[PDB]
PDB file of C-alpha atoms in Angstrom:
ATOM      1  CA  UNK A   1      14.530 -11.801   1.216  1.00  0.00           C
ATOM      2  CA  UNK A   2      17.222  -9.291   0.450  1.00  0.00           C
ATOM      3  CA  UNK A   3      20.838  -9.414  -0.732  1.00  0.00           C
ATOM      4  CA  UNK A   4      23.481  -7.085  -2.135  1.00  0.00           C
ATOM      5  CA  UNK A   5      26.539  -8.337  -3.949  1.00  0.00           C
ATOM      6  CA  UNK A   6      30.017  -6.861  -3.306  1.00  0.00           C
ATOM      7  CA  UNK A   7      30.974  -4.149  -5.837  1.00  0.00           C
ATOM      8  CA  UNK A   8      32.993  -5.427  -8.742  1.00  0.00           C
ATOM      9  CA  UNK A   9      35.210  -3.096 -10.752  1.00  0.00           C
ATOM     10  CA  UNK A  10      35.992  -3.320 -14.515  1.00  0.00           C
ATOM     11  CA  UNK A  11      38.142  -1.132 -16.730  1.00  0.00           C
ATOM     12  CA  UNK A  12      36.062  -0.604 -19.880  1.00  0.00           C
ATOM     13  CA  UNK A  13      39.127   1.234 -21.218  1.00  0.00           C
ATOM     14  CA  UNK A  14      41.626   3.957 -20.162  1.00  0.00           C
ATOM     15  CA  UNK A  15      38.882   6.441 -19.553  1.00  0.00           C
ATOM     16  CA  UNK A  16      35.886   4.483 -18.364  1.00  0.00           C
ATOM     17  CA  UNK A  17      35.601   2.389 -15.259  1.00  0.00           C
ATOM     18  CA  UNK A  18      32.516   0.318 -14.337  1.00  0.00           C
ATOM     19  CA  UNK A  19      31.500  -0.517 -10.754  1.00  0.00           C
ATOM     20  CA  UNK A  20      28.690  -3.082 -10.491  1.00  0.00           C
ATOM     21  CA  UNK A  21      26.516  -4.231  -7.661  1.00  0.00           C
ATOM     22  CA  UNK A  22      23.347  -6.263  -7.790  1.00  0.00           C
ATOM     23  CA  UNK A  23      20.641  -5.743  -5.182  1.00  0.00           C
ATOM     24  CA  UNK A  24      17.715  -8.062  -4.601  1.00  0.00           C
ATOM     25  CA  UNK A  25      14.648  -7.230  -2.512  1.00  0.00           C
ATOM     26  CA  UNK A  26      11.381  -9.219  -2.465  1.00  0.00           C
ATOM     27  CA  UNK A  27       8.057  -9.645  -0.837  1.00  0.00           C
ATOM     28  CA  UNK A  28       7.096 -13.306  -0.596  1.00  0.00           C
ATOM     29  CA  UNK A  29       3.435 -12.715   0.244  1.00  0.00           C
ATOM     30  CA  UNK A  30       2.868 -10.257  -2.557  1.00  0.00           C
ATOM     31  CA  UNK A  31       4.994 -12.297  -5.049  1.00  0.00           C
ATOM     32  CA  UNK A  32       6.920  -9.250  -6.170  1.00  0.00           C
ATOM     33  CA  UNK A  33      10.713  -9.496  -6.542  1.00  0.00           C
ATOM     34  CA  UNK A  34      13.151  -6.772  -7.558  1.00  0.00           C
ATOM     35  CA  UNK A  35      16.554  -7.624  -9.071  1.00  0.00           C
ATOM     36  CA  UNK A  36      18.414  -4.348  -9.453  1.00  0.00           C
ATOM     37  CA  UNK A  37      21.699  -4.031 -11.329  1.00  0.00           C
ATOM     38  CA  UNK A  38      23.501  -0.806 -10.387  1.00  0.00           C
ATOM     39  CA  UNK A  39      26.102  -0.131 -13.094  1.00  0.00           C
ATOM     40  CA  UNK A  40      28.098   2.934 -11.979  1.00  0.00           C
ATOM     41  CA  UNK A  41      30.323   4.415 -14.633  1.00  0.00           C
ATOM     42  CA  UNK A  42      33.215   6.811 -14.023  1.00  0.00           C
ATOM     43  CA  UNK A  43      34.565   8.486 -17.141  1.00  0.00           C
ATOM     44  CA  UNK A  44      37.718  10.575 -17.058  1.00  0.00           C
ATOM     45  CA  UNK A  45      36.387  12.855 -19.776  1.00  0.00           C
ATOM     46  CA  UNK A  46      33.098  13.695 -18.198  1.00  0.00           C
ATOM     47  CA  UNK A  47      32.397  15.521 -14.938  1.00  0.00           C
ATOM     48  CA  UNK A  48      29.390  13.373 -14.003  1.00  0.00           C
ATOM     49  CA  UNK A  49      29.101   9.899 -12.681  1.00  0.00           C
ATOM     50  CA  UNK A  50      26.496   7.785 -14.608  1.00  0.00           C
ATOM     51  CA  UNK A  51      24.299   5.120 -13.071  1.00  0.00           C
ATOM     52  CA  UNK A  52      22.754   2.696 -15.532  1.00  0.00           C
ATOM     53  CA  UNK A  53      20.204   0.983 -13.282  1.00  0.00           C
ATOM     54  CA  UNK A  54      18.573  -2.153 -14.655  1.00  0.00           C
ATOM     55  CA  UNK A  55      15.277  -3.105 -12.928  1.00  0.00           C
ATOM     56  CA  UNK A  56      14.328  -6.779 -13.374  1.00  0.00           C
ATOM     57  CA  UNK A  57      12.622  -9.487 -11.307  1.00  0.00           C
ATOM     58  CA  UNK A  58       8.985 -10.565 -11.084  1.00  0.00           C
ATOM     59  CA  UNK A  59       5.527  -9.217 -10.536  1.00  0.00           C
ATOM     60  CA  UNK A  60       2.909 -11.935 -10.168  1.00  0.00           C
ATOM     61  CA  UNK A  61      -0.520 -11.138 -11.729  1.00  0.00           C
ATOM     62  CA  UNK A  62      -2.419 -12.144  -8.639  1.00  0.00           C
ATOM     63  CA  UNK A  63      -4.767 -14.285 -10.721  1.00  0.00           C
ATOM     64  CA  UNK A  64      -6.605 -17.142  -9.150  1.00  0.00           C
ATOM     65  CA  UNK A  65      -9.041 -19.364 -10.969  1.00  0.00           C
ATOM     66  CA  UNK A  66     -12.708 -18.756 -10.356  1.00  0.00           C
ATOM     67  CA  UNK A  67     -14.660 -21.258  -8.337  1.00  0.00           C
ATOM     68  CA  UNK A  68     -16.292 -23.655 -10.875  1.00  0.00           C
ATOM     69  CA  UNK A  69     -19.326 -24.010  -8.597  1.00  0.00           C
ATOM     70  CA  UNK A  70     -20.319 -20.372  -9.015  1.00  0.00           C
ATOM     71  CA  UNK A  71     -23.685 -20.787 -10.748  1.00  0.00           C
ATOM     72  CA  UNK A  72     -25.445 -17.699 -12.212  1.00  0.00           C
ATOM     73  CA  UNK A  73     -22.627 -15.175 -11.453  1.00  0.00           C
ATOM     74  CA  UNK A  74     -18.863 -15.542 -11.187  1.00  0.00           C
ATOM     75  CA  UNK A  75     -15.687 -13.447 -11.116  1.00  0.00           C
ATOM     76  CA  UNK A  76     -11.939 -13.515 -10.896  1.00  0.00           C
ATOM     77  CA  UNK A  77      -9.092 -11.057 -10.570  1.00  0.00           C
ATOM     78  CA  UNK A  78      -6.377 -10.734 -13.209  1.00  0.00           C
ATOM     79  CA  UNK A  79      -3.303  -8.634 -14.081  1.00  0.00           C
ATOM     80  CA  UNK A  80      -4.758  -5.669 -15.898  1.00  0.00           C
ATOM     81  CA  UNK A  81      -1.631  -3.480 -15.731  1.00  0.00           C
ATOM     82  CA  UNK A  82       1.896  -3.528 -14.309  1.00  0.00           C
ATOM     83  CA  UNK A  83       3.655  -0.273 -13.322  1.00  0.00           C
ATOM     84  CA  UNK A  84       7.396   0.176 -12.676  1.00  0.00           C
ATOM     85  CA  UNK A  85       8.955   3.435 -11.608  1.00  0.00           C
ATOM     86  CA  UNK A  86      12.438   4.694 -10.562  1.00  0.00           C
ATOM     87  CA  UNK A  87      12.830   7.987  -8.798  1.00  0.00           C
ATOM     88  CA  UNK A  88      15.659  10.002  -7.350  1.00  0.00           C
ATOM     89  CA  UNK A  89      15.356  11.734  -4.027  1.00  0.00           C
ATOM     90  CA  UNK A  90      17.434  13.716  -1.631  1.00  0.00           C
ATOM     91  CA  UNK A  91      20.069  15.161  -3.956  1.00  0.00           C
ATOM     92  CA  UNK A  92      19.536  17.881  -6.560  1.00  0.00           C
ATOM     93  CA  UNK A  93      22.903  16.816  -8.098  1.00  0.00           C
ATOM     94  CA  UNK A  94      21.175  13.605  -9.392  1.00  0.00           C
ATOM     95  CA  UNK A  95      18.918  13.568 -12.500  1.00  0.00           C
ATOM     96  CA  UNK A  96      17.264  10.985 -14.714  1.00  0.00           C
ATOM     97  CA  UNK A  97      18.835  11.584 -18.148  1.00  0.00           C
ATOM     98  CA  UNK A  98      17.718   8.611 -20.157  1.00  0.00           C
ATOM     99  CA  UNK A  99      15.819   5.344 -20.003  1.00  0.00           C
ATOM    100  CA  UNK A 100      14.769   2.295 -22.009  1.00  0.00           C
ATOM    101  CA  UNK A 101      12.297   1.649 -23.488  1.00  0.00           C
ATOM    102  CA  UNK A 102      12.028   5.208 -24.652  1.00  0.00           C
ATOM    103  CA  UNK A 103       8.795   4.955 -26.586  1.00  0.00           C
ATOM    104  CA  UNK A 104       5.445   3.186 -26.522  1.00  0.00           C
ATOM    105  CA  UNK A 105       5.864  -0.407 -27.638  1.00  0.00           C
ATOM    106  CA  UNK A 106       3.250  -3.081 -28.386  1.00  0.00           C
ATOM    107  CA  UNK A 107       5.706  -5.749 -29.669  1.00  0.00           C
ATOM    108  CA  UNK A 108       5.241  -9.172 -28.179  1.00  0.00           C
ATOM    109  CA  UNK A 109       8.666  -8.883 -26.848  1.00  0.00           C
ATOM    110  CA  UNK A 110      10.825  -5.914 -26.126  1.00  0.00           C
ATOM    111  CA  UNK A 111      14.539  -6.405 -26.705  1.00  0.00           C
ATOM    112  CA  UNK A 112      17.044  -3.533 -26.637  1.00  0.00           C
ATOM    113  CA  UNK A 113      20.707  -2.819 -26.049  1.00  0.00           C
ATOM    114  CA  UNK A 114      21.652   0.522 -24.277  1.00  0.00           C
ATOM    115  CA  UNK A 115      25.190   1.893 -24.549  1.00  0.00           C
ATOM    116  CA  UNK A 116      27.531   4.342 -22.866  1.00  0.00           C
ATOM    117  CA  UNK A 117      30.061   6.367 -24.858  1.00  0.00           C
ATOM    118  CA  UNK A 118      32.731   8.723 -23.608  1.00  0.00           C
ATOM    119  CA  UNK A 119      31.157  11.999 -22.571  1.00  0.00           C
ATOM    120  CA  UNK A 120      28.032  10.485 -21.167  1.00  0.00           C
ATOM    121  CA  UNK A 121      26.333  10.031 -24.538  1.00  0.00           C
ATOM    122  CA  UNK A 122      23.683   7.454 -24.162  1.00  0.00           C
ATOM    123  CA  UNK A 123      22.362   5.562 -27.201  1.00  0.00           C
ATOM    124  CA  UNK A 124      19.910   2.607 -27.782  1.00  0.00           C
ATOM    125  CA  UNK A 125      19.709  -0.394 -30.488  1.00  0.00           C
ATOM    126  CA  UNK A 126      17.283  -3.326 -30.993  1.00  0.00           C
ATOM    127  CA  UNK A 127      17.609  -7.029 -30.152  1.00  0.00           C
ATOM    128  CA  UNK A 128      20.198  -8.634 -27.780  1.00  0.00           C
ATOM    129  CA  UNK A 129      31.256  -3.192 -29.090  1.00  0.00           C
ATOM    130  CA  UNK A 130      33.383  -5.260 -26.675  1.00  0.00           C
ATOM    131  CA  UNK A 131      35.184  -2.107 -25.539  1.00  0.00           C
ATOM    132  CA  UNK A 132      32.059  -0.073 -24.814  1.00  0.00           C
ATOM    133  CA  UNK A 133      29.605  -0.254 -21.982  1.00  0.00           C
ATOM    134  CA  UNK A 134      26.171  -1.597 -22.767  1.00  0.00           C
ATOM    135  CA  UNK A 135      23.222  -3.166 -20.793  1.00  0.00           C
ATOM    136  CA  UNK A 136      20.166  -5.021 -22.242  1.00  0.00           C
ATOM    137  CA  UNK A 137      16.485  -5.308 -21.654  1.00  0.00           C
ATOM    138  CA  UNK A 138      14.451  -8.347 -22.724  1.00  0.00           C
ATOM    139  CA  UNK A 139      10.816  -8.976 -21.721  1.00  0.00           C
ATOM    140  CA  UNK A 140       7.759 -10.620 -23.070  1.00  0.00           C
ATOM    141  CA  UNK A 141       4.511  -8.686 -22.997  1.00  0.00           C
ATOM    142  CA  UNK A 142       2.239 -10.710 -25.343  1.00  0.00           C
ATOM    143  CA  UNK A 143      -1.116  -8.897 -25.838  1.00  0.00           C
ATOM    144  CA  UNK A 144       0.054  -6.012 -23.656  1.00  0.00           C
ATOM    145  CA  UNK A 145       1.520  -2.559 -24.374  1.00  0.00           C
ATOM    146  CA  UNK A 146       4.277  -0.534 -22.766  1.00  0.00           C
ATOM    147  CA  UNK A 147       3.812   3.215 -22.288  1.00  0.00           C
ATOM    148  CA  UNK A 148       6.015   5.805 -20.623  1.00  0.00           C
ATOM    149  CA  UNK A 149       4.294   7.720 -17.823  1.00  0.00           C
ATOM    150  CA  UNK A 150       3.597  11.258 -18.960  1.00  0.00           C
ATOM    151  CA  UNK A 151       4.668  12.610 -15.571  1.00  0.00           C
ATOM    152  CA  UNK A 152       8.194  11.321 -16.306  1.00  0.00           C
ATOM    153  CA  UNK A 153      10.773  14.075 -15.617  1.00  0.00           C
ATOM    154  CA  UNK A 154      14.261  14.792 -14.367  1.00  0.00           C
ATOM    155  CA  UNK A 155      13.570  13.059 -11.035  1.00  0.00           C
ATOM    156  CA  UNK A 156      11.445  10.073 -12.058  1.00  0.00           C
ATOM    157  CA  UNK A 157      10.794   7.622 -14.878  1.00  0.00           C
ATOM    158  CA  UNK A 158       7.897   5.241 -14.988  1.00  0.00           C
ATOM    159  CA  UNK A 159       6.428   2.730 -17.334  1.00  0.00           C
ATOM    160  CA  UNK A 160       3.058   0.991 -17.589  1.00  0.00           C
ATOM    161  CA  UNK A 161       2.529  -2.420 -19.212  1.00  0.00           C
ATOM    162  CA  UNK A 162      -1.225  -2.721 -19.845  1.00  0.00           C
ATOM    163  CA  UNK A 163      -3.534  -5.318 -21.242  1.00  0.00           C
ATOM    164  CA  UNK A 164      -4.059  -4.192 -24.842  1.00  0.00           C
ATOM    165  CA  UNK A 165      -5.230  -6.642 -27.532  1.00  0.00           C
ATOM    166  CA  UNK A 166      -6.433  -9.944 -26.179  1.00  0.00           C
ATOM    167  CA  UNK A 167      -7.965 -12.669 -28.328  1.00  0.00           C
ATOM    168  CA  UNK A 168     -10.733 -14.975 -27.044  1.00  0.00           C
ATOM    169  CA  UNK A 169     -11.307 -18.014 -29.300  1.00  0.00           C
ATOM    170  CA  UNK A 170     -10.797 -16.066 -32.465  1.00  0.00           C
ATOM    171  CA  UNK A 171     -13.017 -13.259 -31.259  1.00  0.00           C
ATOM    172  CA  UNK A 172     -11.476  -9.951 -30.431  1.00  0.00           C
ATOM    173  CA  UNK A 173      -9.177  -8.315 -29.825  1.00  0.00           C
ATOM    174  CA  UNK A 174     -10.543  -7.203 -26.461  1.00  0.00           C
ATOM    175  CA  UNK A 175      -9.125  -5.127 -23.621  1.00  0.00           C
ATOM    176  CA  UNK A 176      -9.870  -3.709 -20.238  1.00  0.00           C
ATOM    177  CA  UNK A 177     -12.526  -1.386 -21.698  1.00  0.00           C
ATOM    178  CA  UNK A 178     -14.195  -3.369 -24.412  1.00  0.00           C
ATOM    179  CA  UNK A 179     -17.937  -2.897 -24.708  1.00  0.00           C
ATOM    180  CA  UNK A 180     -20.863  -4.463 -26.461  1.00  0.00           C
ATOM    181  CA  UNK A 181     -24.348  -3.156 -25.620  1.00  0.00           C
ATOM    182  CA  UNK A 182     -25.747  -6.694 -25.315  1.00  0.00           C
ATOM    183  CA  UNK A 183     -22.893  -8.842 -24.029  1.00  0.00           C
ATOM    184  CA  UNK A 184     -20.810  -6.294 -22.112  1.00  0.00           C
ATOM    185  CA  UNK A 185     -17.046  -6.650 -22.045  1.00  0.00           C
ATOM    186  CA  UNK A 186     -16.539 -10.130 -23.568  1.00  0.00           C
ATOM    187  CA  UNK A 187     -12.747 -10.161 -22.873  1.00  0.00           C
ATOM    188  CA  UNK A 188     -12.734 -13.466 -20.917  1.00  0.00           C
ATOM    189  CA  UNK A 189     -16.366 -14.625 -21.452  1.00  0.00           C
ATOM    190  CA  UNK A 190     -16.779 -18.226 -22.477  1.00  0.00           C
ATOM    191  CA  UNK A 191     -19.952 -18.649 -24.441  1.00  0.00           C
ATOM    192  CA  UNK A 192     -22.854 -16.274 -24.851  1.00  0.00           C
ATOM    193  CA  UNK A 193     -25.471 -18.964 -24.254  1.00  0.00           C
ATOM    194  CA  UNK A 194     -23.420 -21.542 -22.443  1.00  0.00           C
ATOM    195  CA  UNK A 195     -25.236 -24.026 -20.189  1.00  0.00           C
ATOM    196  CA  UNK A 196     -22.121 -24.220 -17.941  1.00  0.00           C
ATOM    197  CA  UNK A 197     -21.933 -22.822 -14.472  1.00  0.00           C
ATOM    198  CA  UNK A 198     -20.706 -19.202 -14.371  1.00  0.00           C
ATOM    199  CA  UNK A 199     -17.425 -20.366 -12.826  1.00  0.00           C
ATOM    200  CA  UNK A 200     -16.976 -22.629 -15.809  1.00  0.00           C
ATOM    201  CA  UNK A 201     -17.951 -20.020 -18.407  1.00  0.00           C
ATOM    202  CA  UNK A 202     -14.812 -18.087 -18.806  1.00  0.00           C
ATOM    203  CA  UNK A 203     -12.001 -18.480 -21.323  1.00  0.00           C
ATOM    204  CA  UNK A 204      -9.837 -21.304 -20.071  1.00  0.00           C
ATOM    205  CA  UNK A 205      -6.854 -20.094 -18.052  1.00  0.00           C
ATOM    206  CA  UNK A 206      -4.388 -21.578 -20.619  1.00  0.00           C
ATOM    207  CA  UNK A 207      -5.779 -19.380 -23.339  1.00  0.00           C
ATOM    208  CA  UNK A 208      -5.345 -16.157 -21.329  1.00  0.00           C
ATOM    209  CA  UNK A 209      -2.178 -14.144 -21.840  1.00  0.00           C
ATOM    210  CA  UNK A 210       0.703 -15.038 -19.554  1.00  0.00           C
ATOM    211  CA  UNK A 211       0.682 -11.512 -18.143  1.00  0.00           C
ATOM    212  CA  UNK A 212      -3.032 -11.801 -17.311  1.00  0.00           C
ATOM    213  CA  UNK A 213      -2.916 -15.063 -15.352  1.00  0.00           C
ATOM    214  CA  UNK A 214       0.749 -15.614 -14.667  1.00  0.00           C
ATOM    215  CA  UNK A 215       3.417 -13.016 -14.035  1.00  0.00           C
ATOM    216  CA  UNK A 216       5.331 -10.225 -15.615  1.00  0.00           C
ATOM    217  CA  UNK A 217       9.128 -10.299 -15.755  1.00  0.00           C
ATOM    218  CA  UNK A 218      10.033  -6.619 -16.134  1.00  0.00           C
ATOM    219  CA  UNK A 219      13.361  -5.424 -17.536  1.00  0.00           C
ATOM    220  CA  UNK A 220      13.674  -1.646 -17.578  1.00  0.00           C
ATOM    221  CA  UNK A 221      16.720   0.699 -17.601  1.00  0.00           C
ATOM    222  CA  UNK A 222      16.963   4.089 -15.915  1.00  0.00           C
ATOM    223  CA  UNK A 223      19.999   6.260 -16.535  1.00  0.00           C
ATOM    224  CA  UNK A 224      20.903   8.758 -13.830  1.00  0.00           C
ATOM    225  CA  UNK A 225      23.675  11.330 -13.780  1.00  0.00           C
ATOM    226  CA  UNK A 226      25.448  12.665 -10.650  1.00  0.00           C
ATOM    227  CA  UNK A 227      27.743  15.705 -10.403  1.00  0.00           C
ATOM    228  CA  UNK A 228      31.066  14.119  -9.446  1.00  0.00           C
ATOM    229  CA  UNK A 229      32.157  16.890  -7.003  1.00  0.00           C
ATOM    230  CA  UNK A 230      28.975  16.487  -4.964  1.00  0.00           C
ATOM    231  CA  UNK A 231      29.761  14.317  -1.920  1.00  0.00           C
ATOM    232  CA  UNK A 232      26.247  13.766  -0.592  1.00  0.00           C
ATOM    233  CA  UNK A 233      24.536  10.403  -0.658  1.00  0.00           C
ATOM    234  CA  UNK A 234      21.264  10.162  -2.508  1.00  0.00           C
ATOM    235  CA  UNK A 235      18.205   7.932  -2.511  1.00  0.00           C
ATOM    236  CA  UNK A 236      16.593   5.894  -5.266  1.00  0.00           C
ATOM    237  CA  UNK A 237      13.135   4.427  -4.903  1.00  0.00           C
ATOM    238  CA  UNK A 238      12.059   1.583  -7.170  1.00  0.00           C
ATOM    239  CA  UNK A 239       8.319   0.711  -7.258  1.00  0.00           C
ATOM    240  CA  UNK A 240       6.753  -2.390  -8.799  1.00  0.00           C
ATOM    241  CA  UNK A 241       2.949  -2.514  -8.884  1.00  0.00           C
ATOM    242  CA  UNK A 242       0.057  -4.559 -10.236  1.00  0.00           C
ATOM    243  CA  UNK A 243      -3.415  -3.280 -10.975  1.00  0.00           C
ATOM    244  CA  UNK A 244      -5.733  -6.232 -10.610  1.00  0.00           C
ATOM    245  CA  UNK A 245      -8.932  -6.056 -12.546  1.00  0.00           C
ATOM    246  CA  UNK A 246     -12.109  -7.907 -11.608  1.00  0.00           C
ATOM    247  CA  UNK A 247     -13.675  -9.776 -14.569  1.00  0.00           C
ATOM    248  CA  UNK A 248     -17.258 -11.018 -14.063  1.00  0.00           C
ATOM    249  CA  UNK A 249     -19.994 -12.916 -15.821  1.00  0.00           C
ATOM    250  CA  UNK A 250     -23.724 -13.022 -15.236  1.00  0.00           C
ATOM    251  CA  UNK A 251     -26.564 -15.163 -16.672  1.00  0.00           C
ATOM    252  CA  UNK A 252     -29.714 -13.107 -17.395  1.00  0.00           C
ATOM    253  CA  UNK A 253     -32.039 -16.043 -18.384  1.00  0.00           C
ATOM    254  CA  UNK A 254     -31.393 -15.523 -22.100  1.00  0.00           C
ATOM    255  CA  UNK A 255     -27.619 -15.002 -22.392  1.00  0.00           C
ATOM    256  CA  UNK A 256     -24.508 -14.134 -20.523  1.00  0.00           C
ATOM    257  CA  UNK A 257     -22.974 -10.703 -19.918  1.00  0.00           C
ATOM    258  CA  UNK A 258     -19.339  -9.978 -19.144  1.00  0.00           C
ATOM    259  CA  UNK A 259     -17.843  -7.026 -17.305  1.00  0.00           C
ATOM    260  CA  UNK A 260     -14.391  -5.844 -16.405  1.00  0.00           C
ATOM    261  CA  UNK A 261     -13.754  -3.496 -13.493  1.00  0.00           C
ATOM    262  CA  UNK A 262     -10.338  -1.900 -13.644  1.00  0.00           C
ATOM    263  CA  UNK A 263      -7.814  -1.736 -10.810  1.00  0.00           C
ATOM    264  CA  UNK A 264     -10.036  -3.146  -8.058  1.00  0.00           C
ATOM    265  CA  UNK A 265      -7.025  -4.292  -6.043  1.00  0.00           C
ATOM    266  CA  UNK A 266      -3.678  -2.476  -6.255  1.00  0.00           C
ATOM    267  CA  UNK A 267      -0.550  -4.211  -4.940  1.00  0.00           C
ATOM    268  CA  UNK A 268       2.638  -2.211  -4.624  1.00  0.00           C
ATOM    269  CA  UNK A 269       6.183  -2.923  -3.487  1.00  0.00           C
ATOM    270  CA  UNK A 270       8.819  -0.195  -3.140  1.00  0.00           C
ATOM    271  CA  UNK A 271      12.492  -0.452  -2.168  1.00  0.00           C
ATOM    272  CA  UNK A 272      14.493   2.623  -1.149  1.00  0.00           C
ATOM    273  CA  UNK A 273      18.269   2.540  -1.665  1.00  0.00           C
ATOM    274  CA  UNK A 274      20.856   4.938  -0.278  1.00  0.00           C
ATOM    275  CA  UNK A 275      23.453   5.541  -2.971  1.00  0.00           C
ATOM    276  CA  UNK A 276      27.094   6.311  -2.163  1.00  0.00           C
ATOM    277  CA  UNK A 277      28.397   7.761  -5.425  1.00  0.00           C
ATOM    278  CA  UNK A 278      31.994   7.899  -4.250  1.00  0.00           C
ATOM    279  CA  UNK A 279      32.217   4.255  -3.250  1.00  0.00           C
ATOM    280  CA  UNK A 280      29.677   3.067  -5.808  1.00  0.00           C
ATOM    281  CA  UNK A 281      27.736   1.154  -3.210  1.00  0.00           C
ATOM    282  CA  UNK A 282      24.147   0.928  -2.164  1.00  0.00           C
ATOM    283  CA  UNK A 283      22.213   0.087   0.967  1.00  0.00           C
ATOM    284  CA  UNK A 284      18.555  -0.926   1.309  1.00  0.00           C
ATOM    285  CA  UNK A 285      17.274   1.590   3.803  1.00  0.00           C
ATOM    286  CA  UNK A 286      13.549   0.997   3.292  1.00  0.00           C
ATOM    287  CA  UNK A 287      10.784  -1.055   1.856  1.00  0.00           C
ATOM    288  CA  UNK A 288       7.103  -0.601   1.705  1.00  0.00           C
ATOM    289  CA  UNK A 289       4.360  -3.013   0.779  1.00  0.00           C
ATOM    290  CA  UNK A 290       0.748  -2.231   0.086  1.00  0.00           C
ATOM    291  CA  UNK A 291      -2.404  -4.093  -0.952  1.00  0.00           C
ATOM    292  CA  UNK A 292      -5.606  -2.113  -1.072  1.00  0.00           C
ATOM    293  CA  UNK A 293      -7.942  -5.167  -0.899  1.00  0.00           C
ATOM    294  CA  UNK A 294      -6.049  -8.143   0.480  1.00  0.00           C
ATOM    295  CA  UNK A 295      -7.337 -11.710   0.273  1.00  0.00           C
ATOM    296  CA  UNK A 296      -8.606 -11.430  -3.339  1.00  0.00           C
TER     297      UNK A 296
END
């Protein structure tokens, strides 16, 4: 599905005008949905247009329960990491100038307010002025951590939201790389000497983090500036991705061993928008969908 709302216009005050359009683009098979709020700001005091682009929607984990009949060995795939990126193409007059979250964050939920002030000053505050422009982000990431991609620059911003500190029946925390020389990576292992089938010897699904077995609901803001005298369109590409890890267990005739294999299936959805900075409108000119190992 895809949809773009008509532009709405709002006078923030005598100097600042807001033009807002919301674009939706999804992939039903992949269970990835992008809800993009394009907030274009024109400011009489400042010679650049500002786009405060909010990226929201859904990225399913891809988890499926293991087969409970699996006897001596079992496995499942889970949401090890979610990646979101926004990049500018096709116009050297456009630059990423700010974004939120700015810094690494391991809070169970991320809640921020981002504001526009005359002159293009961008500022940020925490949690969720009536005559100033602001936009908010709010997402849960329990047991996970947000990092900013170190390749981030003037043409691209990306974030990763990675499994970080996961408890397993009071044991842990564990993550994607935990290691014990006897039991392996015990992240989602049930019991070390369980008499259950392998498929029944994992942490119950309900006890896994929501991001591991459910979905992530991203909310990220990219702030882009555009030289107002430049008349060329530009392109913005928004990518949502999941890295699916394969968690396994194995019975060795004395005890179980767990293992986690990172990013064994990568699922990516990208939408490409053409941006008309003079009319403050966007068009979906492209999508691409990828799955490196489909069917898992």
